[PDB]
Amino acid sequence: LDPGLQPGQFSADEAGAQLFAQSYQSSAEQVLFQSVAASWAHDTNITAENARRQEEAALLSQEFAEAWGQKAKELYEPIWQQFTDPQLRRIIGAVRTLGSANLPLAKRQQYNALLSQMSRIYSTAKVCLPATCWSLDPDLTNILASSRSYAMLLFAWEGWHNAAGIPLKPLYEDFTALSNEAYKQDGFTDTGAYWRSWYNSPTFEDDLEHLYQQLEPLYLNLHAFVRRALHRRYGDRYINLRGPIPAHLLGDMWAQSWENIYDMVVPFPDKPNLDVTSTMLQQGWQATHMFRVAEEFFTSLELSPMPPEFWEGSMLEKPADGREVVCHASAWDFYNRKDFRIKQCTRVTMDQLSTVHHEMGHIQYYLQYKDLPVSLRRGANPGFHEAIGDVLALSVSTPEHLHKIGLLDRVTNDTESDINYLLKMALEKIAFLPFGYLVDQWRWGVFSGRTPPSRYNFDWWYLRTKYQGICPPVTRNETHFDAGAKFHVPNVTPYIRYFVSFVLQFQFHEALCKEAGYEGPLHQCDIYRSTKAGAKLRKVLRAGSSRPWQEVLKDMVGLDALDAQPLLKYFQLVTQWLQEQNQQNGEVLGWPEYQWHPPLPDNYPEGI
Ligand SMILES: *[C@@H]1O[C@H](CO[C@@H]2O[C@@H](C)[C@@H](O)[C@@H](O)[C@@H]2O)[C@@H](O[C@@H]2O[C@H](CO)[C@@H](O)[C@H](O)[C@H]2NC(C)=O)[C@H](O)[C@H]1NC(C)=O
Ligand SMILES: *[C@@H]1O[C@H](CO)[C@@H](O[C@@H]2O[C@H](CO)[C@@H](O)[C@H](O)[C@H]2NC(C)=O)[C@H](O)[C@H]1NC(C)=O
Ligand SMILES: O=C(N[C@H]1CCS[C@H]2CCC[C@@H](C(=O)O)N2C1=O)[C@@H](S)Cc1ccccc1
Ligand SMILES: *[C@@H]1O[C@H](CO[C@@H]2O[C@@H](C)[C@@H](O)[C@@H](O)[C@@H]2O)[C@@H](O)[C@H](O)[C@H]1NC(C)=O
Ligand SMILES: [Cl-]
Ligand SMILES: [Zn+2]
């Protein structure tokens, strides 16, 4: 480690620790930037060499965290928890958490390299036929979204899960062991316990379970209503009205949101098509237009536009030069207060417009807290970060707003168009809730040892059936590693943040709509051009992680905890309607035939 990055001598008291923190975060900006820069070069251009360079940067980051962590324990380990400055206590507590810098050098290299190889496998895996080959994005994504051929959907689902998951499993086992070894030396029972510590809530898991209990009836009724529609399309042979739904039939490779089968379950197909994708294509929208439209929503709230460095440096379309890239959408802070970027293989669809807003919400956060010391350049918690752009997307998706931006002819404020809209939104938001909850239940069990390699897939499908009420459409065994076929697992991105975000965003929406002076139904609110709403949001974003998220949340919504009531209030009308439809059709809520799996299509896979 270069001498200019190594820690100096400071007095072992709070005054000295304030200077210590200043010195730490001036040198951390330089180290963070070289790490982020090298990850960018790899993720937009996957090669062996860019992997080598990203690993050299990670090693340097670990030398740096080691030097400053040790010094902080040396100087302040007995005293810092009694510092009177609460922001300083946060910074010091973070610095003395070394994570993978606790590993000896050779295990640092093995850990850094497992990450590179798992990333490569996920983002370069292909599904080949009997002879070109399909990538996840756009090819398999488009098939899962738009094909209504059971056998084609099956070939894509099985092909993807086999191609990504199987080769990842031995690597994922090795990564898990090294991660745990590292964080045990910070005092955590396992890596999962460290991830959970970010929410600074002793009742976190209980609080999440309580939340899910209030939401599950909504999901169960949505599930039964959709299962009935799939039964009509595919037949009693492939759909069991009292069993789990085959996992390839819900419009999405992971069955995690169902908006792509809206056209199949829309009760009132005579009414205007609330999926404006066709109009977007008709009108010639491109990725740049989508990002500019999102930007203008932010500036309408008097938040910040995207800076020149964003437009010059971001990757907004999949490269056509054949380069391999990580296509999964992501947002990047280079910790130099100047460079901020999105990397997204943008497609022209309505759901991609929502994802553009999701990613730009991250950038806005970065811009609002870029002048905090680096340790506070974080969401109040990770769920806050994932929620920001989704909140704006809630306003954008209203038929009123879509009409304002030229994507929909005005609809009638009647009950039936209301039901169409809330149902489309339920397919996007309610259907996700079980998946957002279960992914880290699986991963926490892996980190804790409750789920050894011998049960990776057994416990994954236990949770997928328990929570989502789906089943694999072909037999699986422990050679398969179906959790590995979901980006965040090999790319080691925690997931409970998305469950938190999907609850939180309705708490935020309700607060911002009240602040805008809106007084109609919550699900028709559009906060566009509300400078009052923008001001309330700006307060959150500029706080970073300098204050406890419970306090930041109370300032914003009036309450110091996650709360399902705003989401329930948003969906109330369709919650009731779905309950009624299910009763009239005599549905069974849930999936009591929990063992059921569909048969294979005749002659599969030969007829394609
Ligand atoms: C749309 O109409 C609502 C009124 O609800 C209607 O009632 C049903 C019987 C059926 O007609 C639904 O399709 C309708 O939505 C308006 O909401 C009211 O706004 C006032 C304003 O002061 C407010 O005080 C009331 O509480 C609101 N009532 C309800 C039931 O929420 C709403 O503003 C209209 N919005 C648009 C965009 O047309
Ligand atoms: C993708 O990354 C590779 C490095 O792995 C880049 O290849 C280098 O390209 C520069 C061009 O300025 C040459 O000077 C080097 O000799 C190349 N090195 C190797 C090993 O090929 C490549 O340019 C990158 N591609 C893009 C589109 O940025
Ligand atoms: O979050 C992300 N990207 C989005 C894009 C699609 S929308 C969104 C909401 C639903 C849940 C989740 C889903 O798709 O699985 N999700 C995403 O992953 C990125 S910022 C996460 C990331 C962080 C660091 C490095 C790399 C990636
Ligand atoms: C695991 O599964 C592998 C492939 O799946 C198999 O093929 C389908 C068509 C069905 O026959 C299904 O029952 C099978 O699982 C097998 O190659 C492998 O032997 C299976 N067992 C193990 C231990 O890997
Ligand atoms: Cl998280
Ligand atoms: Zn995100």
From Swiss-Prot:
The active site is at E359, H488. Changing N413D: In Ndom123456 mutant; abolished dipeptidyl carboxypeptidase activity. In Ndom1234569 mutant; does not affect dipeptidyl carboxypeptidase activity. Ubiquitously expressed, with highest levels in lung, kidney, heart, gastrointestinal system and prostate. Monomer and homodimer; homodimerizes following binding to an inhibitor. Interacts with calmodulin (CALM1, CALM2 or CALM3); interaction takes place in the cytoplasmic region and regulates phosphorylation and proteolytic cleavage. It is found in: Cell membrane; Cytoplasm. Residues 11-592 form the Peptidase M2 domain. Belongs to the peptidase M2 family. Zn(2+) 1 binds at H358, H362, E386. It comes from Homo sapiens. One of its GO terms (biological process) is regulation of heart rate by cardiac conduction. GO terms for molecular function: actin binding; bradykinin receptor binding; calmodulin binding; chloride ion binding; endopeptidase activity; exopeptidase activity; metallocarboxypeptidase activity; metallodipeptidase activity. Glycans are attached at Q9, Q25, N45, Q82, Q117, Q286, N413, N477. The record marks N491 as: Not glycosylated. Inhibitors of ACE are commonly used to treat hypertension and some types of renal and cardiac dysfunction. Its main location: membrane. The lineage of its organism: Eukaryota, Metazoa, Chordata, Craniata, Vertebrata. Disulfide bonds join C128-C133, C327-C345, C513-C525. It is linked to Ischemic stroke: A stroke is an acute neurologic event leading to death of neural tissue of the brain and resulting in loss of motor, sensory and/or cognitive function. Ischemic strokes, resulting from vascular occlusion, is considered to be a highly complex disease consisting of a group of heterogeneous disorders with multiple genetic and environmental risk factors. Renal tubular dysgenesis: Autosomal recessive severe disorder of renal tubular development characterized by persistent fetal anuria and perinatal death, probably due to pulmonary hypoplasia from early-onset oligohydramnios (the Potter phenotype). Keywords: Calmodulin-binding, Carboxypeptidase, Cell membrane, Cytoplasm, Disulfide bond, Glycoprotein, Hydrolase, Membrane, Metal-binding, Metalloprotease, Phosphoprotein, Protease, Repeat, Secreted, Signal, Transmembrane, Transmembrane helix, Zinc. This is Angiotensin-converting enzyme. Induction: Up-regulated in failing heart. Dipeptidyl carboxypeptidase that removes dipeptides from the C-terminus of a variety of circulating hormones, such as angiotensin I, bradykinin or enkephalins, thereby playing a key role in the regulation of blood pressure, electrolyte homeostasis or synaptic plasticity. Composed of two similar catalytic domains, each possessing a functional active site, with different selectivity for substrates. The gene is ACE. It comes from the Eukaryota. Chloride 1 binds at Y199, R497. GO terms for cellular component: endosome; external side of plasma membrane; extracellular exosome; extracellular region; extracellular space; lysosome; plasma membrane. Phosphorylated on tyrosine residues on its extracellular part, promoting cleavage by secretase enzymes and formation of the soluble form (Angiotensin-converting enzyme, soluble form).
